[PDB]
């Protein structure tokens, strides 16, 4: 066997001031980033974990050692008490959020489709969190392995980096929804679906009235039509 | 006596410790209880306390620490022997994340830790690569990560080992 630690522990009992500095000194993590494979459940990522998706591969790295995380750190350095209350208050007013509503407008512009979207407020919370930390596109489809609907969060760039604080907020706001990272036709997508709450009584008729007054960008609605066409034969696993 | 040392080891962090052990006859029962309240992000020096328990005993043992989600805080139960049925994290050195739901628990014994250390090609030289538990209390869940930590300056650690070798 091995007893190589025995001379140190005899010394550590005699020198307490050295024991404090030795324990505190063990701060540098040996593994700063580890490879992952898609489909990847984001629920496997802890509070300081960041997700990186690229042609270089898929990685679950430590935020404290990550340069992409460090750059965004002064901008989103924001309390949960006001964060939880923020997307709850912003659920009442959906006018500025053109990207979210345009997806509903392009797919099915009826009040019955808007009734079903507003029935799952956690999906707007997912979009709100991912918007802050930017140019994402949402797609609503029916869950064939659950009368509930699932959301696809399509990323615009060939390179993707989800901040450790951003996915901490994302998982927290969507407790009751499973978030899995996928790749479909060179596009990185996050599938937000029900796995198994203080939310306002959403008036579907009032937002539907506002939708008629709102003038959407034509190029964004056709983009959604093309994106919905591309994600039809996706078939995400359970 | 061991609680005095454990409180000193954890003095740097914000982990509460609860207040006799015979070196010739070690107890099968729980030796220590380390608590971590909601919101906290403190680190537990797992490998260090497990190896400290091995040096404390003069009779062959396999020290074990159980990590539980009490549904309010994180619980770290200390043992000189892994109790029958006690859980062990199936983690590797690279893949070390464990998410604990309310009332659920995981654990780590020195022997199982040594197997992980050797399988991951990690350095066995004293205090060069030490496993520590990084815990994030995100209610109702307890997020754990069994990461290997090294010193910021290895030249300082090698000199400390010489000081221990000198006094022998
Ligand atoms: Cl999925
Ligand atoms: Zn990062």
Author numbering:
A (entry chain A): 24 to 100, 102 to 157, 160 to 172, 174 to 223, 229 to 270
B (entry chain B): 4 to 22, 26 to 174
Question: Can I see the authors' text?
Answer:
Although nucleo-cytoplasmic transport is typically mediated through nuclear pore complexes, herpesvirus capsids exit the nucleus via a unique vesicular pathway. Together, the conserved herpesvirus proteins pUL31 and pUL34 form the heterodimeric nuclear egress complex (NEC), which, in turn, mediates the formation of tight-fitting membrane vesicles around capsids at the inner nuclear membrane. In the nucleus of infected cells, pUL34 recruits pUL31 to the inner nuclear membrane to form the nuclear egress complex (NEC). Thus, the NEC represents self-sufficient machinery that can mediate inwardly directed vesicle formation.
To produce high-quality diffracting crystals of the PrV NEC, a pUL31 construct (amino acids [aa] 26–271) lacking the nuclear localization signal was co-expressed in E. coli, together with the conserved region of pUL34 (aa 1–179). Data were collected for a selenomethionine derivative of the complex, the electron density map was calculated from experimental phasing, and the structure was refined to a 2.9 Å resolution. One heterodimer was present in the asymmetric unit. The crystal structure of the heterodimer displays an elongated shape of ∼50 Å in width and ∼100 Å in length, with the putative membrane-distal end being composed of pUL31 and the membrane-proximal part being composed mainly of pUL34. Each protein of the heterodimer is, overall, globular, with the exception of helices α1 and α2 of pUL31, which extend around pUL34. pUL34 has a β sandwich fold comprising nine β strands. pUL31 has a complex topology, with 11 helices and nine β strands. Notably, a C3H zinc finger (ZNF) motif is present, with three cysteines contributed by CR1 and a histidine by CR3. The four residues coordinating the Zn2+ ion (C73, C89, C92, and H188) belong to the most conserved residues in pUL31. The extensive buried surface area on both proteins (∼1,850 Å2, corresponding to ∼13%, for pUL31; and ∼1,750 Å2, corresponding to 18%, for pUL34) is likely the cause of the observed high stability of the complex.
